[PDB]
Paper text:
To further explore this issue, we have conducted biochemical and crystallographic studies on the interactions of six GSTOs from [name] with chemical libraries. The six TvGSTOs (named TvGSTO1S to TvGSTO6S) used in this study are representatives of the twelve TvGSTOs that have a catalytic serine, while four others have a cysteine instead. In this study, we demonstrated at the biochemical and structural level that [name] GSTs that belong to the Omega class interact with polyphenolic compounds found in wood, and in particular with flavonoids such as dihydrowogonin and naringenin. The ability of TvGSTOs to bind polyphenols through different sites suggests that fungal GSTs could be involved in the transport of various polyphenols.
The structure of apo TvGSTO3S was determined by X-ray crystallography at a resolution of 1.35 Å. It has a typical GST fold where the N-terminal thioredoxin domain of one monomer cross-interacts with the C-terminal all-helical domain of the second one, and vice-versa. TvGSTO3S displays the highest sequence identity with Omega GSTs, though its closest structural homologs identified by PDBeFold23 are Tau GSTs. The N-terminal end of TvGSTO3S helix α1 harbors a serine as the catalytic residue instead of the cysteine found in the other GSTOs structurally characterized so far17,25. It enables efficient GSH-transferase activity towards usual synthetic substrates and disables reductase activity.
Numbering used by the authors:
A (entry chain A), B (entry chain B): 4 to 244
The structure:
């Protein structure tokens, strides 16, 4: 019965995580776009003082999202939101019930956060060399069950945490968006198409085929256009060597 | 009933997290020290292919920790291990049961991970400026309940996640451990003693007063000596900005 409002932005993989989870949960919820990188509304720090998307309000009186209530719980940090949605909707089985399988999900989310995400950021925002990112992606790929399935076997929030980033990689590379050079772009495109990365390609197809992805993705071309609005992606700019 | 083995090192705040949680759970468990920074045993990648401490094995036959079994589950990443211990020992109430309070715990862990931990690492190991670390610590302090108590009210794994780092800060500063400049050491010592940080000092005292801390801490001087064994804490080197 308690309302959920998610403050979102199409470009944001962090917001995308939470939309996927809410879809998989069958939740009733509102989304409200915020132009966080270019024109943040003066009320936005009332929902998230960190001034980041996503933000979430929970409960309180039903109010317009641009008039947030002080009575709603304010929840920050996308991974905390994923665990919250799992806790709110236990019948949706957004995590396994077995402790070891649950730990596979948590480990996969930590491997992504601690080893992969920062490599994506370095390559895309600074144009650092692509090899350490490919190495990190090969490590993450090796944590998947080789013969098929999601991170913990059955789909879980671990897959919501990771697919937004992997799904953006392919179309962003095809558009040449990000500070890496053409040489490294070609290298990453060839690597991600090679047998070395067949398993992570299967993973991306499997996550993308679910309605939770279809219903929260604008389309590859539209997602690229939204990403070009991100100041830190510096459309038209590339660093070399 | 299944065995728990935690591969540990006294200097490591990451391993310390998990020891605290195991104590709070009342678990039966084995610890085994690993000289991971100077002399990693050849068998260690069998328990953690990432070659990091902590490592955990769960179940399988009872074997000496230096003879790990292929049959035990290998669990990596300290925050995944914290959630695993909470899942294995529900009667110990290592997380709240209320979803919003659980989300406070997960948010606190994410705030620490995403904003504070990298600042501690960069100030101590690279000598980067201390002001962003102090700003991150003030933000984390602001997430605590103002009147006392732990991150989510009652003690939870969020406090296990954070106290190893905060508890090391004070004696490390007094011993002059770290690559930051003298000026920044003075700044940090004065700040951490100032009224600005009264709330986090109370938090550290409250977490340290619990048996789970006392029984997993070697003593301030002993912890300082263990930290001096860390190669990246190069004695006699300082960076200046
Ligand atoms: Ca506050």
């Amino acid at each position: 019965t308690k309302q959920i409002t998610l403050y979102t932005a199409t470009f944001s993989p962090y917001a995308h995580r939470v939309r996927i989870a809410l879809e998989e949960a069958g939740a009733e919820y509102t989304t409200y776009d915020v132009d966080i990188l270019r024109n943040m509304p003066d009320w936005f720090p009332l929902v998230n003082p960190l001034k980041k998307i996503p933000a979430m309000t929970f409960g309180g009186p039903e109010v317009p999202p641009d008039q947030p209530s002080p009575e709603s719980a304010k929840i920050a940090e996308s991974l905390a939101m994923l665990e919250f949605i799992a806790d709110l909707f236990p019948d949706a089985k957004l995590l396994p019930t077995d402790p070891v399988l649950r730990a596979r999900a948590r480990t996969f989310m930590a491997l992504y956060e601690n080893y992969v995400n920062g490599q994506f950021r370095d390559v895309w925002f600074l144009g650092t060399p692509a090899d350490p990112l490919l190495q990190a992606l090969e490590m993450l790929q090796g944590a998947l069950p080789p013969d098929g399935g999601f991170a913990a076997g059955e789909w879980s929030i671990a897959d919501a945490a990771v697919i937004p980033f992997l799904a953006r990689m392919f179309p962003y590379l095809e558009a040449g968006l990000g500070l890496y050079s053409k040489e490294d772009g070609v290298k990453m495109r060839k690597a991600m198409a090679s047998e070395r990365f067949a398993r992570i390609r299967q993973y991306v197809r499997d996550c993308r085929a679910r309605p939770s992805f279809a219903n929260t993705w604008a389309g590859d071309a539209e997602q690229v256009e939204a990403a070009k609005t991100v100041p830190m992606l510096r459309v038209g700019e590339h660093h070399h060597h």
